[PDB]
């Protein structure tokens with residue numbers, strides 16, 4: 406049961422206003438035929454245009470909400486809306502485009518999907534709240550057949566060109582006019598009461614209904630993200646490497662060790678309260694401090710209320726020492742904290758738009774993250790960049806320019822001249838730091854944190 410059987414039943418009630426008289430008894434096999442596509446008993450990698458909820462979740466990076474609204478049905482213009490915010494008007498003859506024939510609309514769809522998806526996925530999954538017009542419009546810009554490879558590379562084909570009779574992936578599709586072998590899922594098949602807007606608005610206030618097709622497309626995809634990543638969470642699902650995932654994760658571990666080690670050296674806290682991932686390990690294993698762990702899985706819906714994490718009767722005294730919240734998202738951090746908080750507003754290939762201001766951060770696993778909120782950090786300050794090292798000044802073993810920097814907290818810098826080892830390590834650390842920040846992570850610390858307190862650790 407890897408793929409969705411074409412003989413599975415499709416509920417047609419949501420389609421009967423656009424398609425009156427539609428049979429109640431319907432399979433994906435008959436629906437695909439009604440849509441004008443012919444499968445031809447083909448076991449060549451494309452068993453069904455529609456996919457299961459499980460297959461959709463594995464391909465969340467490919468999700469593109471799609472809605473079609475009748476402007477005036479073969480005789481009337483259609484408004485094609487996508488979760489990218491694009492609206493195209495196709496004539497049968499929040500970016501809005503004037504009425505144009507299908508032969509040119511299809512070229513724009515291919516360009517838009519290719520630019521949106523080339524750095525995200527090997528395919529497209531059209532996320533629908535199917536009412537009819539969207540399914541009957543697909544024959545005008547979609548071609549199907551056996552699974553194919555790109556004419557210029559080894560990636561699977563996502564586009565077809567009627568001009569050259571060739572196939573291309575999202576990276577090599579310039580000038581292509583048909584979407585080839587797309588996938589799709591109808592959110593209405595999951596069991597819902599009432600319309601799209603009423604279900605969407607139960608969980609989200611950030612997307613409105615400006616009464617255009619792209620608004621519906623955005624709400625449809627937001628509702629699907631809510632159902633699959635907020636109300637239901639699966640950390641077993643692995644996602645492929647598409648960018649700097651490995652460097653980002655390594656940078657996060659390097660920064661965590663640095664910041665916590667320096668906070669413990671600078672303020673000598675007798676106890677550290679490590680709140681968050683139940684599989685956390687001590688990030689500064691050689692530190693003297695009493696290390697106490699508190700389990701909290703990553704919150705996917707709303708940030709944790711500090712009152713619920715700390716109260717209702719553990720050291721009990723979280724006010725003693727320091728609290729470490731490494732990606733443990735709370736409504737208001739206590740004043741004695743060290744925090745790493747993902748900024749959902751960051752633009753990247755790893756960060757997808759999410760539900761109610763949240764974002765879906767996909768890096769090995771999918772993490773729906775509640776909306777970034779500057780008021781969570783009112784008791785703290787931004788953690789400035791610094792590099793600290795107590796390791797010996799010794800090279801061992803890449804050409805050099807002498808390092809001069811007030812933030813290189815080492816014995817050699819205290820002595821007036823940064824050594825080659827500490828200059829190389831500082832530059833590698835700065836690159837790791839910049840990688841983590843650019844990925845969207847933000848760092849915050851208790852207001853008394855002062856790197857001037859690190860210089861006396863060199864006695």
Ligand SMILES: Cc1cc(F)ccc1CS(N)(=O)=O
Pocket residue numbers: 702703704705732733734747766772773774775
């Ligand atoms: C974005 C992110 C990355 C990560 F590695 C761990 C957690 C989070 C945020 S959370 N706890 O809301 O899922």
Ligand SMILES: [Zn+2]
Pocket residue numbers: 555556557558559560573574575576577
């Ligand atoms: Zn290619």
Ligand SMILES: [Zn+2]
Pocket residue numbers: 605609610611612623624627628759760761
């Ligand atoms: Zn929404």
Ligand SMILES: [Zn+2]
Pocket residue numbers: 797798799815816817818823824825826827
């Ligand atoms: Zn040195």
